Design a protein around this nucleic acid. Structure first.
Lengths: 107, 82, 94, 100, 86, 98, 107, 94
DNA sequence: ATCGATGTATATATCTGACACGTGCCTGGAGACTAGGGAGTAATCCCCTTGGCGGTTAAAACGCGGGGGACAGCGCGTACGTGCGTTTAAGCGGTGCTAGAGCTG
DNA sequence: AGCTCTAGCACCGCTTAAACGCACGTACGCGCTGTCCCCCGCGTTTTAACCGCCAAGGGGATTACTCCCTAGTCTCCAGGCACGTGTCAGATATATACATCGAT
């Protein structure tokens, strides 16, 4: 019959088959369930969608249509929750926030 | 060719600029010395892991893969070089 | 030789969330590392949850617990829903 | 004797405190950092080579360490009712993390 | 199995108990504002640990929060605990 | 004429007394009630093993004594001897918990 | 022939076979070499022997013939290298090292 | 049923290093947990070292590199020394 | 309070090399297939957690006094910062070299 | 074991802005001195933790059964990746408008 990719059956933009092969070849367990690569591809797609959503918002705030890892750093760090996930993460060519302490301002 | 010392190569206005990227107003005179010290011990810790990673693979150069992997083991993942 | 990555997939995801945004090659590398690291975290705790319960399979329950584990907060309330709908699609497609 | 126009000590510091936090360029010069990386990897063995991306990643990670440590150092300094940093602030920021 | 809907148990960690917990750490004097910030950070830490512990229980389809689940939950946050099997 | 010691002496005496002892500084039953209160809104009608409760005892006590040692260092750095909530926040936020 | 344990073949007292079985069942790799269990058992013996030696010395300093977990904390926290190893590790029934800051000491 | 533990082995280690000193049960479980934790750490680092070099077999060199990464300072040198003499004794006695 | 230079930002055009797009090509995802044992379920025993009771008593809570210790204020003074001028080595480019990655067998 | 060939390394020149040292000034560190209120130690008082005993029975654990599910093998083809081409958006440059900071 005509072959259909499992990501399209799942309605996903991330590969079910590649994730399933990596779960097999990562040797995490002896067996891998059917819906587990679908579910993991879906959570990867959701995280990618949120992080690129914040990246696009930061880029539009910067008025720069192609996103830079600076825009990525503003995307990850300004989010109150996503910063906790990427807390022990250094983004290459990322930089820091333009924060000035209230005492350090001139009188 | 063996280098004698370039701890002084880490420039004092360069430490001033890194601290200003950190968000400070004024810098003490000793900061240029203990900042070089902590940078030296951190680079010692990272480079030791990097070179032993390279020695594990029968390789005699140090790739960015092994630097990123040593940083990942150290507790600070680095995104941008694989 | 050929090298395997996630560049076209994150490009498709960015295109479907934003039709008029570009993205640099350094950001290709960062998304590749980020997807690989999140996959490594989730699959690692899936293996740990399998080994804690004397479990020989990794089903959707282990991955669901891992997603509730790594991610706190409202994404913990989001990513366990979205992926659930994914398998809700899959059981309606198989 | 007349004097040229000049700023207060601290306000051009704030002008570049805003200027240096909006950019993402590397702060340490590339050659001295590469030479330092080469000299640290000497007691391990000689005749070791580094790719340019390896030195790039090392410099970016070390600059990230120094910027995070300097935010913590400035925060320890502002805790002690001071606006400038001190060495004992550096050992405080190292000691709280449990890496001293 | 809960006998009653418990509430306001944060005062169970008393001011003298906070005083001993500070004394083991090696501090001489305690201000009056310590005794609620300490209770707040204690509440935050226990919420963070018990959330992971109860997810470990519900993955096992159990009703009892065993010691092994608490050990693994503390191992997940980077604070490994010994003496409870491991 | 009572034997009132100087305030700032018996505090150090009991510092030395507690630092050699492994007894549990938090009573078992208030921590039972607190653990049940925290675990109540995560699932109703949960049960706890006694060894799990002891694990909560030891992990909580170690975390609190480490936090108080860090805030003691932060306080003595700030030319003071009495810890304050700003010391708590400073030690936590340098540690990265905030 | 006569069965003879691999632990005595290696001059080793932690078991070779148990470490080999937990290496195979631990899903670390698809294959495990012959020298891997004996090397890992030797490393485990060195660490256990070092901590037990320091705990015995600490118990002689306290004058009991028993290692209480307080002695284990005193053993693993007084040695700087073992402190660096077991830094993020909590040992039950251990307490803290009896240290007082010199600012707090009056004279 | 029976639960596996490293109790008697670290007990005879104690009898070898301190022949006139016993052990308590709580400290016995603490040492068992320490053995399991270090075993998991070194085996996980060896698994990473094998996977990162496209290697499928964990050899003695894998764990030698893993213990060179994990154990800091002079314990690394004594660990690799005792591991090397153990494996040479194993090969010579075989 | 007001006005001025110095500084950052705003706007428009030219220019360029990275990224968007397309094409050829092939490893690996997909469909079909059988088999085996892990997995889900039920039946079962029973350790063990919850619950209640009672008395013991260690300890929490309470108020008291008083004096360090916190902290505002002040002055002084060294050490910063800002600036100009000079010096210097990074930065950039090309050239030339081969060690040593990297793939196949 | 061995061939191929990327790229790390060595170097050399010049243009370059930072790097460097120094000169002048002032805000800021540190210490003193002030008030004082804040907490510690106390006995008295009071609550509940604690022991332990008993008991109800849920719930984890074991044993047993049977079946859906996934590794495994085989065949096949299209999505995916390397490769190539060419716009086009961002960097660069110059002119213009607005605003923070200085000091009239």
């Amino acid at each position: 019959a005509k072959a259909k990719t499992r990501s399209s059956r799942a309605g996903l933009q991330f590969p079910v088959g590649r994730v399933h092969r990596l779960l097999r070849k990562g040797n995490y367990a002896e067996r891998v369930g059917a819906g587990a690569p679908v579910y993991l591809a879906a959570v990867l797609e959701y995280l990618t969608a949120e992080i690129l959503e914040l990246a696009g918002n930061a880029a539009r705030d910067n008025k720069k249509t192609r996103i830079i890892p600076r825009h990525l750093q503003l995307a990850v760090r300004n989010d109150e929750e996503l910063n906790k996930l990427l807390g022990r993460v250094t983004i290459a060519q990322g930089g820091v926030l333009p924060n000035i302490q209230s005492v350090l301002l001139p009188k | 060719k063996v280098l004698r010392d370039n701890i002084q190569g880490i420039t004092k206005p360069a430490i001033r600029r890194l601290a200003r990227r950190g968000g400070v107003k004024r810098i003490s005179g000793l900061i240029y010395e203990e900042t070089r010290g902590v940078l030296k011990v951190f680079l010692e810790n990272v480079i030791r892991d990097a070179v032993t990673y390279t020695e594990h693979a029968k390789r005699k150069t140090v790739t960015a893969m092994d630097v990123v992997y040593a940083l990942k083991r150290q507790g600070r993942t680095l995104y941008g070089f694989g | 030789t050929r090298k395997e990555s996630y560049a076209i997939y994150v490009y498709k995801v960015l295109k479907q969330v934003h039709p008029d945004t570009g993205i640099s090659s350094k950001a290709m590398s960062i998304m590749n590392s980020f997807v690989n690291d999140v996959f490594e975290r989730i699959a690692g705790e899936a293996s740990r949850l399998a080994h804690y319960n004397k479990r020989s399979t990794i089903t959707s329950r282990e991955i669901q617990t891992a997603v509730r584990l790594l991610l706190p907060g409202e994404l913990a309330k989001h990513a366990v829903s979205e992926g659930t709908k994914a398998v809700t699609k899959y059981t309606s497609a198989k | 004797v007349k004097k040229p126009h000049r700023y207060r000590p601290g306000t051009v510091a704030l002008r570049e405190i805003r200027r240096y936090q909006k950019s993402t360029e590397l702060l340490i010069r590339k050659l001295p950092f590469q030479r330092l990386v080469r000299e640290i990897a000497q007691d391990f063995k000689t005749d070791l080579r580094f790719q340019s991306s390896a030195v790039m990643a090392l410099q970016e990670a070390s600059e990230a360490y120094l910027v995070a440590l300097f935010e913590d150092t400035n925060l320890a300094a502002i805790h002690a009712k001071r606006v400038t940093i001190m060495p004992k602030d550096i050992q405080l920021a190292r000691r709280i993390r449990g890496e001293r």
